[PDB]
Design a protein around this ligand. Structure first.
Ligand SMILES: CC(C)(N)CNc1nc(-c2ccc3[nH]ncc3c2)nc2cnccc12
Ligand SMILES: CC(C)(N)CNc1nc(-c2ccc3[nH]ncc3c2)nc2cnccc12
Lengths: 388, 387
């Protein structure tokens, strides 16, 4: 039917989850222009004329659509080979956000941002950091996320000899947060206290969805490359032929609980190897201090997590973790946990206070022919309907 | 301002006159897919992955959006070097339209459709044929125009000995239609009876805006190439260095009036040379054959039009043409003309009757398979239009 077709098309342009929505289509034009505007390609009349025709229109669109110049760097909080994570401020609104930058040159040359963009944009979970905006240019991919003023658990652990009650609270919240990721069909693969952020209320939210892999019908993943941080990496991810499930995320929870209660990671070494050697021989290298500061149940939970896959707590689902004695407390309940009073409530001067975060501080060659470097990134643009 | 930018962007996507509206953006993706889907280019990972990613959505869009397969050829009515012109019927609605097809291939071998598309789409004039839809594929540009069941003036002239009273009606209507085009900032450059179509009521509409050129601040045009039909071409367009105005359109009106009243074009010959030579020498070649038929005022109007541009009627605007004695008549006023009863009212069986149009007949040369990106669809991005 005639107008049915226009309506179906209009919904194709409407849909934020659609690959052909207005922003995905603007991505295409923008990519095409960047991918064609080179002197060698402009020798082609078709390319030259098209670029001349669209010059004014593309400059207008580029100005109107969200750009790097709309934000001001307040503080640099993270750094990777792929890019930086920084605390920014929208120049007009003065609102503080977290911005993750990914180098397009680094994406193409030895590669994930799709799932990272999707989890943060459409998770609608109190456990996952919300993504407000996703935009780009010929050099970077940008992810404007909700600001978490309480900082990370690394900062918390560096200020306190974490009492058990707090360790129980943060472990329980990570279990819930990980169970949320798992229900979406993903294994985090990089669970660590640097990726656990605290909101204004002091409750946890997960970050870094950059290693998230979608599980299969058997809830497994085929990966032959090591992923994650040396201290938190499970033996199975280290040994990766590789066919593993969501249990690698539970191994990291046991590393996290040990770290909070002991003050050090269980398999710490002077090198990348030796760390990896200790993880392999966790059976004889996992030891606790000879003192009464860590309870029987805490030690058992760590050990129930720090074992081989097939015997690890969480191989029969969350309920077996939720039911562990370590979680028995007269302070919270699993279904009421994010509504309880957090152990550490951030005492922030203002909504723009960045105190809880420590301040830190080449692209593509010119083509001689069409190579289409912007094509892997068409559709990355995303804008939230959320107002303030 | 933040919200402002999204609204401004939201207007740009909506605007039918915008270069970045939803349909031009769909045109871009479609173009890009056609120009990249070749085995040689698919050796490029970026191109290969992109095409794989967009396979399903491109097939959906292609199916949903208007296509050639939505229309059925009723009759072939025209044939140019750049494509055909045919009377079509939308398969679902059963409504008859006129469709102009332009071969994107042929066009690439030395290239105008922009102004033709724009005049017919945005003219909103009872004198200009309305373009309902403009769409395309990897091979053709399509223009779905309103159907004019009375046929053209060539057909009319071939069936009747045009009395001076009818000649006045059709001349007056062309004057109004041309004045409408000039007010939009264009010179038609191809005024001829073949491009004058009649509606159900017997009223004229100008068609084929394939030679239309936009005037400058001085109401002039820089063109060094001859444009139009040999018989109707003005001396100034023929002499083209070339810097001319809207007066070339008025020369053609004088050819049209002469043709209707005389039964032959004033500078006719058995070649494209014999005719071109007869135009350059209009001062001695213009003659009226022996009769009591053609009135004093009719001859004066023809001559006031068939002169050099600096002495031609219409160099001081339409009012001097409108005021000519030839137009003095009791039946109509310039302001009441398209509301009057036409001299010939088409006697059509139905709204789908195509009898005033002669049917013509109906394996194409197409773009070679690229070994590298060539971007053949790029000249046509933005052509899609839906009213
Ligand atoms: C000190 C840190 C927390 N380790 C910095 N590293 C990263 N932080 C964040 C992030 C997300 C949302 C946020 N809201 N407020 C702050 C904030 C920070 N995302 C990342 C994603 N991939 C890698 C590293 C990071
Ligand atoms: C014998 C004819 C009618 N002159 C055929 N030649 C052309 N016809 C038309 C056209 C437009 C709208 C119409 N509506 N109803 C009929 C109809 C015909 N457009 C053109 C555009 N460029 C060149 C030639 C033509």
């Amino acid at each position: 039917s005639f107008e049915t077709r226009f309506e179906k098309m209009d919904n194709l342009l409407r849909d934020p989850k659609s690959e052909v929505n207005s922003d995905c289509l603007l991505d295409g034009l923008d990519a095409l222009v960047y991918d064609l505007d080179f002197p060698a390609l402009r020798k082609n009349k078709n390319i030259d004329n098209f670029l001349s025709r669209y010059k004014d229109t593309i400059n207008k669109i580029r100005d109107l659509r969200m750009k790097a110049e709309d934000y001001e760097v307040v503080k640099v909080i993270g750094r990777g080979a792929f890019g930086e994570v920084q605390l920014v401020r929208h120049k007009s609104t003065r609102k503080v956000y977290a911005m993750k930058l990914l180098s397009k040159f680094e994406m193409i040359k030895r590669s994930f941002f799709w799932e990272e963009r999707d989890i943060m944009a459409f998770a609608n979970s109190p456990w996952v950091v919300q993504l407000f905006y996703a935009f780009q240019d010929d050099r970077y991919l940008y992810m404007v996320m909700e600001y978490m003023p309480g900082g990370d658990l690394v900062n918390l652990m560096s200020n306190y000899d974490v009492p058990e009650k707090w360790a129980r609270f943060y472990t329980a919240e990570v279990v819930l947060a990980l169970d949320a990721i798992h229900s979406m069909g993903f294994i985090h693969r990089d669970v660590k206290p640097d990726n656990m952020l605290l909101d204004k209320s002091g409750h946890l939210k997960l970050a870094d969805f950059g290693t998230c892999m979608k599980m299969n019908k058997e809830g497994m993943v085929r990966c032959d490359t090591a992923v994650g941080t040396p201290d938190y990496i499970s033996p199975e991810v280290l040994k990766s032929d590789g066919y593993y499930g969501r249990e690698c995320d539970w191994w990291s929870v046991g590393v996290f609980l040990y770290e909070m209660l002991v003050g050090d990671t269980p398999f710490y070494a002077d090198s990348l190897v030796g760390t990896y050697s200790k993880i392999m021989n966790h059976k004889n290298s996992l030891t606790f201090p000879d003192d009464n500061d860590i309870s029987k149940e805490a030690k058992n939970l760590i050990c129930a997590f720090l074992t081989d896959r097939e015997v690890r707590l969480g191989r029969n689902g969350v309920e077996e973790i939720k039911r562990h004695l370590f979680f028995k407390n007269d302070q919270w309940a699993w279904e009421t946990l994010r509504d309880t009073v957090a152990p550490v409530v951030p005492d922030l001067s203002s909504d723009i206070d960045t105190s809880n975060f420590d301040d830190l501080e080449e692209t593509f060659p010119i083509p001689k022919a069409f190579v289409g470097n912007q094509l892997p990134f068409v559709g990355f643009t995303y804008y939230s309907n959320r107002r303030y």
